[PDB]
Design a protein around this nucleic acid. Structure first.
Ligand SMILES: [Mn+2]
Lengths: 106, 101, 105, 87, 103, 79, 109, 99
DNA sequence: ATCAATATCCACCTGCAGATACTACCAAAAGTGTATTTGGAAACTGCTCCATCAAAAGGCATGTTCAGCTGGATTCCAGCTGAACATGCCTTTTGATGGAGCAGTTTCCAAATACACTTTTGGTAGTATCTGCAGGTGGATATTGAT
DNA sequence: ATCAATATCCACCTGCAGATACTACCAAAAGTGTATTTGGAAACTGCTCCATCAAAAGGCATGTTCAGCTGGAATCCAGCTGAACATGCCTTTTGATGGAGCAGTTTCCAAATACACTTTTGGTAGTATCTGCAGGTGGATATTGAT
């Protein structure tokens, strides 16, 4: 049996393990860590997916693309901060216009 | 007629992603373009974590990264409520690992 | 009789601007023209170092990443006139935005 | 059979509308006259900046081509990590 | 009742003079206790009843201030940019946004 | 008073180092209310190292790394 | 011991310590013996380069011993270093004499 | 006496050594020294880590001197690099010639 | 141009918070041949991709004319703010200890790990059918603007 | 409020490239099992160092009074910056062929790891004068701001 199901996950605790030895951040690699890791990564993916999903729906579409993704990401407080210096190809911006730039009094 | 000098295996999570995709939205699809952000989502974060962890080792002259470091790493890196969940989510599967076989 | 200006339809100064902000904000395609930007990526390299090659892709980032830049800097700038109490962006605004960001001195 | 013609002053290959467009996307309504030029140079500084890097990659791997990865390595390393193109 | 025309350094001068005075000085510009009071008031909310190393608090009083000191230069600019000279808190808010603070 | 225990003249004193001529009345609170975030964020990152090495004292090393990873790196304490 | 590697290069920077220092952080599996020198050299020069302009800043304000303020003035008054430490704070360093334009007495001249 | 003897090894001494080869008659406060150790330290990692980064991109494992050059090329601004890039390509060929 | 009223900046004065230099000391940081390990350049060399011309064509940039309205300099002006200047509370301090608690230690099994088998699998080629969305035509309602 | 004139919602369809969907191979990677080898919990106590208390002082702060004028606020007015209009060029689009110069398989060696045993010196830990400076003393007159 596999270590994924073994920890009840979808991410590869095998493949992330490799990328911790070959990676060189330390010599000795723990045994809980690579699990904790996969898990960690998996939450995020998920978090953001469940986000640009509703986005995807908002504009009545069913195939999440970058735009919805950047709508997810940006339209949300905690994520934004995680990717404050990050960038997303065909990103699109969040629609928005400053106020004094709107016309009034005839 | 194919396989013309074996190209160094380019390996992504496009499966692992899409696995966890269907869980969130059963009927809701995904671009290459749309995915091809997602893989860097992982890509980006992993290294940010492996990194910050590696740093902690040498702050305590430790040679190994425990899932305790990862927590601290995540606890530092991942902000607000995103950290909380993760912390627990991390442990949850960790525990499923520690109490097996 | 001689009192009614002219006949052709014209929109007020800035009402196409609003019309457009609304637009180039709604979508996402890269905003300068491929091959003209292209050369500017070719020519700046060739000036660092000659006999060189750009991957079909690799100019793309340089562009994608490069708009992005400004559009986001532009935002910082749009904000700066507004702050000075204005609707118009004159260099200084940028220069100021560059300044604070820590881009110059 | 080669080409490689003279390559000078392309910055204006960044043209008023296209500049102006980013000014829309930016949420900008009224554009000064000096802008477009001022703008053209910042792009260069930019470009100028990221490409030293992406080449110093190519340059280094003993490469003669600016592979997608390079540019990205060079973007992230500057503060502007980009998702999409590779790595 | 009076004094027969007193010496009053017409306002603004003492300011410019203090700038001259304070810019070339290097030592910190906040009382250590109130700081160490505040350095201990907040910190608790992450781990309870702690101790601060001799240097630790000051390393902050370096940074904390160092952050502010600069944060002001930036504010002034904005004020000046709006053709002003007095730093209205709107400036600060604007000067936060830009660095990547409120945005 | 703690945060209010941060003096309006000290606010002025540090501002003068930035070359502030004229200080509006509101600034004094805002300064405190911009100094707070700074600290919360700084110390948060700091203590998190403490809590790793198993310590009840915020070391100096605890901080350097906080300010480094914060991006506001500091010089002359790491000893 | 006979003679030093740092002397085999003519420095005051421990080519020995470097080669071990470049293991503790775990920067790679293998190290080319050229690097620990190449590094030391650069670091060495760099340290000097400041000291120079810092020691240069000493006479100007009639004092002999270098204080932080002199190290800060050394750093910021240069271009190529100001940038190199555009994201760094020296403890107790203070700030360079800079008063903005509009602020001076009798309007703006 | 070897109990609390856990060393805090620093560049400080080497820095004073250098403090002399251009300004041989100069004092430096122990707090102004504390800075200079935070300097080279910073400069050490920065370059090292970059040369450490410069490995895997190329599927590398041995940090050769080259990737240090490049690290510093990538690291150090304008004119100020040129010298350093030189300074280090120097010493390398000296120790090549040396024992 | 006059000159009271301060703040400032020069050598000259001396004491202490602070750097300078020596002696005692010992685990470790460093250097040296050795015997063995493998990364990595170096050539043949397939194969993918980029530089390149082709020609069609067409959307999008240019530049010029004409105005509507936003900037700039206008004086202004009322209350917000620096200055002084009176206290006077409230940091500063050093002085020198209760006492943690971080440092330090020598243990000692769980945890990491490198070695040789084992078994799946996820990734690419290649092959071949579906299917979401850009995109064009076209028919009601929206917003803007001249009335 | 109504008329008029452009841009846009809103659903409608093609049509094809962009996803997703099989086989089939198939190389590495992932997992199982024991063996080795070790980094760090786990208590015990030292000792540098962190926490208020002590006990006079007044330095730095605040609440204070008055104007000195800077923010903001209108008023006007020249002219830039937008909307539009007429063109056309150079951008864009689609294949097509050399041919680079990149990538992977196959080889053999310069250089480096992993041991093992002796050698030099940087941090530690004091005891003592060394020493430039960091804050008072006159004395001077520029920088300020009344006349
Ligand atoms: Mn050129």
């Amino acid at each position: 049996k596999t270590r994924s199901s073994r920890a009840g996950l979808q991410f590869p605790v095998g493949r992330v393990h490799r990328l911790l030895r070959k990676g060189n951040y330390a010599e000795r690699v723990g045994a809980g860590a690579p699990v904790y890791l996969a898990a960690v990564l998996e939450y995020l993916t998920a978090e953001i997916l469940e986000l640009a999903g509703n986005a995807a729906r908002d504009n009545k579409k069913t195939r999440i693309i970058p735009r919805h993704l950047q709508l997810a990401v940006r339209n949300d407080e905690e994520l934004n901060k995680l990717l404050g210096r990050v960038t997303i190809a065909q990103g699109g911006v969040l629609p928005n216009i400053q106020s004094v730039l709107l016309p009034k009094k005839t | 007629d194919g396989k013309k000098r074996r190209k160094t295996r380019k390996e992504s999570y496009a499966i692992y992603v899409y696995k966890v995709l269907k869980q969130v939205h059963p009927d809701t699809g995904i671009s290459s373009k749309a995915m091809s952000i997602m893989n860097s989502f992982v890509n980006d974060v992993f290294e940010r974590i492996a990194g910050e962890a590696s740093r902690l080792a040498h702050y305590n002259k430790r040679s190994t990264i425990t899932s305790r470091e990862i927590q601290t790493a995540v606890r530092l890196l991942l902000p607000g409520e995103l950290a909380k969940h993760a912390v627990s989510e991390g442990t949850k599967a960790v525990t499923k690992y520690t109490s097996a076989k | 009789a001689t009192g009614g200006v002219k006949k052709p339809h014209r929109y007020r100064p800035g009402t196409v601007a609003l019309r457009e902000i609304r637009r180039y904000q709604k979508s996402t395609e890269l905003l300068i023209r491929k091959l003209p930007f292209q050369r500017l990526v070719r020519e700046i390299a060739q000036d660092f170092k000659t006999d060189l090659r750009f991957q079909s892709s690799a100019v793309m980032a340089l562009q994608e990443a490069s708009e992005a830049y400004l559009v986001a800097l532009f935002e910082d700038t749009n904000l700066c006139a507004i702050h000075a109490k204005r609707v118009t962006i004159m260099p200084k605004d940028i220069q100021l935005a560059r300044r604070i960001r820590g881009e110059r001195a | 059979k080669r080409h490689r013609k003279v390559l000078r002053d392309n910055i204006q290959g960044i043209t008023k509308p296209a500049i102006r467009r980013l000014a829309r996307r930016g949420g900008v309504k009224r554009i000064s006259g000096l802008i477009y030029e001022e703008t053209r140079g910042v792009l260069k500084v930019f470009l100028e900046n990221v490409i030293r890097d992406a080449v110093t990659y190519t340059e280094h791997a003993k490469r003669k081509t600016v592979t997608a990865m390079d540019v990205v390595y060079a973007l992230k390393r500057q503060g502007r990590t980009l998702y999409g193109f590779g790595g």
